[PDB]
Design an enzyme around this catalytic site. Structure first.
Site, PDB file in Angstrom:
ATOM      1  N   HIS A 134      57.563  49.260  27.506  1.00  0.00           N
ATOM      2  CA  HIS A 134      57.833  47.777  27.668  1.00  0.00           C
ATOM      3  C   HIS A 134      57.892  47.434  26.089  1.00  0.00           C
ATOM      4  CE1 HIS A 134      56.650  46.549  31.784  1.00  0.00           C
ATOM      5  NE2 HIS A 134      57.237  47.672  31.818  1.00  0.00           N
ATOM      6  N   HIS A 151      59.777  57.032  36.137  1.00  0.00           N
ATOM      7  CA  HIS A 151      59.147  56.888  37.330  1.00  0.00           C
ATOM      8  C   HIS A 151      58.830  58.223  37.983  1.00  0.00           C
ATOM      9  CE1 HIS A 151      60.421  52.364  37.636  1.00  0.00           C
ATOM     10  NE2 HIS A 151      59.616  52.533  36.680  1.00  0.00           N
TER      11      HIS A 151
HETATM   12  C1  HEM Z   1      65.104  49.722  36.517  1.00  0.00           C
HETATM   13  C2  HEM Z   1      64.348  49.778  35.501  1.00  0.00           C
HETATM   14  C3  HEM Z   1      63.002  49.771  35.877  1.00  0.00           C
HETATM   15  C4  HEM Z   1      62.048  48.808  36.436  1.00  0.00           C
HETATM   16  C5  HEM Z   1      62.592  47.514  36.981  1.00  0.00           C
HETATM   17  C6  HEM Z   1      60.736  49.488  36.253  1.00  0.00           C
HETATM   18  C7  HEM Z   1      59.756  48.692  36.906  1.00  0.00           C
HETATM   19  C8  HEM Z   1      58.518  49.055  37.267  1.00  0.00           C
HETATM   20  C9  HEM Z   1      57.314  48.621  38.056  1.00  0.00           C
HETATM   21  C10 HEM Z   1      57.363  47.396  38.516  1.00  0.00           C
HETATM   22  C11 HEM Z   1      56.449  49.470  37.654  1.00  0.00           C
HETATM   23  C12 HEM Z   1      54.896  49.321  38.594  1.00  0.00           C
HETATM   24  C13 HEM Z   1      54.067  48.408  37.611  1.00  0.00           C
HETATM   25  C14 HEM Z   1      52.511  48.495  37.842  1.00  0.00           C
HETATM   26  O1  HEM Z   1      52.255  47.877  39.068  1.00  0.00           O
HETATM   27  O2  HEM Z   1      51.801  49.148  37.238  1.00  0.00           O
HETATM   28  C15 HEM Z   1      56.966  50.536  37.148  1.00  0.00           C
HETATM   29  C16 HEM Z   1      55.976  51.818  36.668  1.00  0.00           C
HETATM   30  C17 HEM Z   1      56.427  52.542  35.593  1.00  0.00           C
HETATM   31  N1  HEM Z   1      57.418  52.740  35.080  1.00  0.00           N
HETATM   32 FE1  HEM Z   1      59.012  51.778  35.385  1.00  0.00          FE
HETATM   33  N2  HEM Z   1      60.744  50.566  35.729  1.00  0.00           N
HETATM   34  C18 HEM Z   1      62.069  50.747  35.253  1.00  0.00           C
HETATM   35  C19 HEM Z   1      62.403  52.054  34.670  1.00  0.00           C
HETATM   36  C20 HEM Z   1      61.295  52.541  33.619  1.00  0.00           C
HETATM   37  C21 HEM Z   1      61.613  53.404  32.426  1.00  0.00           C
HETATM   38  C22 HEM Z   1      62.991  53.507  31.876  1.00  0.00           C
HETATM   39  C23 HEM Z   1      60.490  53.984  32.266  1.00  0.00           C
HETATM   40  C24 HEM Z   1      60.490  54.895  31.163  1.00  0.00           C
HETATM   41  C25 HEM Z   1      61.443  55.617  30.675  1.00  0.00           C
HETATM   42  C26 HEM Z   1      59.401  53.453  33.015  1.00  0.00           C
HETATM   43  C27 HEM Z   1      58.111  53.925  32.915  1.00  0.00           C
HETATM   44  C28 HEM Z   1      57.234  53.630  34.201  1.00  0.00           C
HETATM   45  C29 HEM Z   1      55.997  54.018  34.050  1.00  0.00           C
HETATM   46  C30 HEM Z   1      55.244  55.170  33.101  1.00  0.00           C
HETATM   47  C31 HEM Z   1      55.309  53.400  35.012  1.00  0.00           C
HETATM   48  C32 HEM Z   1      53.953  53.697  35.745  1.00  0.00           C
HETATM   49  C33 HEM Z   1      53.055  53.172  34.775  1.00  0.00           C
HETATM   50  C34 HEM Z   1      51.606  53.195  35.264  1.00  0.00           C
HETATM   51  O3  HEM Z   1      51.248  54.180  36.022  1.00  0.00           O
HETATM   52  O4  HEM Z   1      50.581  52.384  35.064  1.00  0.00           O
HETATM   53  N3  HEM Z   1      59.946  52.807  33.990  1.00  0.00           N
HETATM   54  N4  HEM Z   1      57.960  50.259  36.651  1.00  0.00           N
END
Ligand code: HEM
Ligand code: HEM
EC number: 1.11.1.21
Lengths: 713, 713
Positions: free
Chosen positions: B85, B251
């Protein structure tokens, strides 16, 4: 606007209107000043061909420009009103406003409903400004133009001091009120003859200098009107005798402008089309200038000689009976009954007009106090010419500060009663040796070093830079009313004063041409005690002199008492302003930056500068030593904070794991761990590597506050 | 808030929403910076115990705090979301956003609907920040932690470069949109399966990083959602291969958090109570943390090993069939049809859940282009690990600029294709003697001075300081696409190019070791010609090198082409942005202060630097000569300005008395006479005594713009 580029879109102030903002601690930076890093205006003004300028100004007086003709062939009235609006935004409550910085050329002053046609008055002066270059500032030129105007029309001025520098942006530290529509007044009152005006305001309407010239809420009631004037002029530091002299001596010249309806007048400068080049209020009625001019909407000419000094105003006001009437724009005014046309037309030398007056003018004859004063001025025309000169001088210089910032040849030799005069030093200043010796001797009085620091801070933090009133010089914390200020802890203050006094006699008693004042001892006690607490050499500049009660108006200084002082854990917020909002406002008044504010709070806390001895924010196990404990403990991730009551002002820090009680704090503390921008500052000082740095920054910030009024330097 | 204190009340922005503001040229001043004035971060970072910090970050990964527990006992997923982010707000359209300045700590990013719970993420890092002091910046730390999180979970990163300094204020030059409601988007579309996202936005909702996780406006249509991803990731510089590697590799770890209804979650940090100490989103559901966490409101966990690297994401997405369902909060999500619970619970080692996914995830297997790339990564698990590492490295360093600004020991030696690489100098640089000789040779060419200046300004002028891309170094004006940009005047540009090429060859022949680049030559053409026309010595720093087309991606540089450029009298406003707003935005991008902006336009205009040869704003009788004529004639009260049409872009200056035609202008000219704050700047340079001062300021400001990208220095 929310347009798709850099500068645009929704802002932070949009999403979070209640949020605290630190903008007023980031203003007037060099980056926005075009001048050379080493520019010294005082030196440049001294090199000015001052009499050259005055002649030039005198010349401009009868130099009618076709784009904005001169009424009567003389621009004095307009220039007098220009300088009286520049200076008249001043309010004694917080010391803000006035002509000290020439803010009339910026928003929002430039576009105020009272400032119509003043845009043209300033444009008339550009050629002369262009010629004198940077040796005359708009701030000083605007006011000196009003002086020269009076001198050109036969009036003897009292003096003039220059030195006002120029600003480069609009000042965001002034609260002009909360109303959202021009002339609005709904919020500052809380209608008839019994409404109370909100502090710190000194005006009855938004966009107005003092009062409605038609009457309160547009009702031509001159006794109700006179009550607004007393209040508004009171908040601008003028009494009854000075108010009468100002209005009469002022409406002694010129005229008003309301030749046709006001719908004919267009946008204010800040909303006017770009091709208008900073002029607004384009008028579609007639020529839109000269005789068809429309400024206020009132058509009044007060004297039989508008471009010459005399007693026409008080004479006509007292010789005719007046009746209400309306102006060609529908505005409420007055006219004389059974009287032939004796007043000249501004453009036609073959015409003359009936006497007219304003509700606010008539109020001066109808209020019993103003009547009495007006008759005294009719009875002695010389006492009037003198009172007006004096009040005019006061008007243009009341936000200038100590005579030590006054420059030029027309500066008066006479001390004025509103001056807050401090006598220059006339003895041998103390040396590095008396200084070292005096520190020693002070500390050796047995006075708690927390007291020494508190009182030195109490002496200094009394300065407000808007006005440039207050501070350690003069040592008036010893006089009234600062000695009974609660925030100043008078029992302590006295113990400290007794001690410093005894030290003072033994020194000055040792004969010799060397002496020390009490103002210098009070600072020196802080210095001694601070050095003891940090182990660092704390700078110190001698030279203050003691001031006497005669030059300390108790009423004047009544306005400098804080409602809330976060540096000292005093006071609490109101329903409109939070505690932390009062601290940011006080930091602005002391000219402190955001990091300076942060350092000072951490240091003063570990050092026990709380007014009543509370332990709020003393996040240290070693009160009295200057460490960075405050920051380390505030940001300490294992403490949690609950509010201690419902008011939301005091809080409890406790251990997350254990739940044991650790500390107590106020809002002046917690904001530093809550506000994202302040927290970044605290993080610098709480790092394992930041104590040495913090200590340096605090002694720098301390010494800065100790010399805030040393203009004599 | 309109509170009766300093900092409160109605502002200029309230009275005049359309009014142009110069705030973005007054940001990030030293006054708001606490660090000592000598402070150099690059030097402080190089002295960091880099390996000790990584170790610490590695320990922190499994160091569960009770105040915000680790899922699966590893904070890595959280730390990865945090860094994605910080870097993910970037956008190529204007180069703004990204993690280069750690703006995630400040409003509005700290309180965005996508950054829930990241306030806690960063608070977890304060102890480590406290340890290493000023030798690590939040800006670097936020992104390094994301890298250590991957390494700690068995993934091999490509590299890491540090050097990002911290900031202290929120950045006001970013337009996040004009919607006034969070998550809103009614304004950036201007409805349908396919709509156009407004420039320069790169997000479909206000407060979101890229796309809606439930789908467009909350509808779970994955193909429709795939069109949003392609667009938003396109505007953030990522292609289809890189987009698939980022979402999949990302993810591939962690989980989402949506345990109860979202009405249980309280205010965001900027509106949260003071005792919360900068954390927001207080959750009243359950424990409010740990297994009861509510962040986005989606309860999804992607892989059977959320704390371990592998191919679970691509595998599960391609193994099961999906059906839409709902979260305990009502959000639209997907669940696998026909499967056993194979993924583990974050707190329970005896529990397992069914495969789950997001609409945006499913979109990757449904869009025909994304499906193909998803399949190739399944077919090659090595190419996937490598693409992800490379897209990650690109994500965290895309706004950092030239490799010359990259520091640290994990910097990759391999040159990347999105870099804009410029070869380092491998020859002797020209010396004071070759500069004097070449200066004389270039002017001898007979190329018009206005062309030498115009092209040097066109070369230098291409820099944007948000991104750190552009500028004279590399001499990419020669290359595509700049070589056919209308503002660059391709005909003239070529002429100047030919002439310079010839000078370059004779210099490179014999003289042996010593060579000159065409970049040093383009800039030097300006210096020579500027000296000729000023009589002043214009500084000059050589060392620029030429760049090749292989390292000049034509799609990257398409975004630097201006829509309007007031410095070259090019373009005009839109319905949402005025010409003068585009100039203030471009001055920000070039890091210019308000006075520097003012000097540059007066100078460029008398020097005839308009793109098409127009006489717009050339307010001098001596074109080609550097004087302060521009400001003298602009501020002349005996000139008036009529609009030249119903459009409001071009204007006619005429004499007031004789109505004789004098000048022509645009909005980029007249704003300096209309805007009060700019006019004060122009007044300094139009003074009888301000021409030498001006000339100096212009050569300073000129040399400043000439070295904007010289990080190699
Ligand atoms: C289509 C694009 C993306 C969307 C809309 C998106 C949205 C989200 C959302 C809503 C969560 C859950 C938030 C929560 O409740 O903790 C999440 C988790 C996560 N996303 Fe994404 N994401 C996207 C792509 C990516 C990318 C490109 C990365 C890194 C390269 C990433 C890394 C993560 C990580 C590490 C988590 C887990 C965070 C945690 O465990 O607290 N995401 N994502
Ligand atoms: C009760 C307080 C006062 C009010 C409400 C007031 C209001 C006004 C108004 C409405 C005008 C006519 C504006 C126009 O159409 O041009 C005017 C004229 C003027 N006032 Fe005041 N005034 C007050 C006191 C003063 C004071 C104290 C001074 C100076 C000491 C002053 C100096 C002038 C001058 C010089 C003019 C004529 C300007 C010109 O000829 O263009 N007034 N006043």
């Amino acid at each position: 606007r929310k347009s798709n580029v850099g500068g645009g879109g929704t802002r932070n102030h949009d999403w979070w209107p209640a949020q605290l903002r630190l903008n007023i601690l980031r203003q007037h930076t060099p980056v926005s000043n075009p001048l050379d890093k080493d520019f010294d205006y005082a030196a440049a003004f001294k090199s000015l061909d001052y009499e050259g300028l005055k002649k030039d100004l005198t010349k401009l007086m009868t130099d009618s420009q076709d784009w904005w003709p001169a009424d009567f062939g003389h621009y004095g009235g307009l220039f007098i009103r220009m300088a009286w609006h520049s200076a008249g935004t001043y309010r004694v409550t917080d010391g803000r406003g006035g002509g000290g910085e020439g803010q009339q050329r910026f928003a929002p002053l430039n576009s105020w409903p009272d400032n119509v046609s003043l845009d043209k008055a300033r444009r008339l002066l550009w050629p002369i400004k262009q010629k004198y270059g940077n040796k005359i500032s708009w701030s000083d030129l605007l006011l000196l133009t009003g002086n020269v105007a009076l001198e050109s029309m036969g009036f003897k001025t009292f003096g003039f001091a220059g030195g006002r520098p120029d600003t480069w942006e609009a000042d965001e530290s002034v609260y002009w009120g909360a109303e959202t529509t021009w002339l609005g007044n709904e919020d500052r009152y809380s209608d008839i003859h019994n409404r109370d005006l909100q502090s710190p305001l000194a005006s009855s309407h938004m966009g107005l200098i003092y009062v409605n010239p038609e009457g309160p809420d547009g009702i031509p009631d001159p006794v109700a009107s006179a009550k607004d004037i007393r209040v508004t002029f009171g908040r601008m530091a003028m009494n009854d005798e000075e108010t009468v002299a100002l209005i009469a001596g002022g409406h002694s010249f010129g005229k008003t402008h309301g030749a046709g309806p006001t719908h004919h007048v267009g946008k204010e400068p800040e909303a006017a089309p770009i091709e208008h080049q900073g002029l607004g209020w384009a008028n579609s009625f007639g020529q839109g200038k000269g005789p068809d001019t429309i400024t206020s909407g009132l058509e009044v000419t007060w004297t039989p000689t508008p471009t010459k000094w005399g007693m026409g105003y008080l004479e006509y006001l007292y010789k005719f009976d007046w009746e209400p009437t309306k102006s060609p724009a529908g505005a409420n005014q007055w006219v004389a009954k059974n009287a032939e046309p004796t007043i000249p037309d501004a453009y036609d030398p073959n015409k003359k007009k009936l006497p007219t007056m304003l509700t606010t003018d008539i109020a001066l004859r109808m209020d019993p106090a103003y009547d009495k004063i007006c008759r005294d001025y009719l009875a002695n025309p010389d006492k009037f010419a003198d009172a007006f000169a004096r009040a005019w001088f006061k008007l243009l210089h009341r936000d200038m500060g100590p005579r030590t910032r006054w420059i030029g040849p027309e500066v008066p030799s006479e001390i004025l009663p509103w001056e807050d005069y401090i006598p220059p030093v006339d003895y041998q200043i103390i040396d590095d040796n008396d200084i070292a010796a005096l520190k020693k001797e002070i500390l050796a009085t047995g006075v708690a070093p927390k007291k020494l620091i508190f009182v030195a801070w109490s002496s200094a933090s009394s300065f407000r830079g808007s006005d440039k009133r207050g501070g350690a010089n003069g040592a008036r914390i010893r006089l009234a009313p600062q000695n009974e200020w609660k925030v100043n802890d008078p029992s302590t203050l006295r113990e400290v004063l007794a001690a410093l006094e005894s030290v003072q006699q033994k020194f000055n008693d040792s004969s010799s041409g060397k002496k020390v004042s009490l103002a210098d001892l009070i600072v020196l006690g802080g210095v001694a005690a601070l050095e003891q607490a940090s182990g660092l050499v704390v700078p110190f500049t001698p030279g203050r002199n003691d001031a006497t009660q005669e030059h300390t108006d108790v009423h004047s200084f009544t306005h400098l008492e804080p409602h809330a002082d976060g540096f000292r854990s005093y006071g609490k917020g109101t329903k409109r302003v939070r505690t932390e909002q009062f601290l940011i406002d006080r930091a602005s008044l002391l000219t402190l930056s955001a990091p300076e504010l942060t350092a000072l709070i951490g240091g003063l806390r570990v050092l026990e500068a709380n007014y009543d001895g509370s332990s709020y924010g003393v996040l240290t196990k070693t009160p009295g030593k200057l460490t960075n404990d405050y920051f380390v403990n505030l940001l300490d991730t294992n403490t949690a904070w609950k509010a201690a009551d419902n008011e939301g002002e005091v809080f409890i820090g406790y251990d997350r794991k254990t739940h044991d009680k650790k500390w107590t704090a106020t809002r002046a503390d917690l904001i530093f761990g809550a506000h994202a921008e302040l927290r970044a500052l605290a993080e610098v000082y709480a790092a394992v590597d930041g104590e040495e740095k913090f200590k340096r920054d605090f002694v720098a910030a301390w010494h800065k506050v100790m010399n805030l009024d040393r203009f004599d330097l």
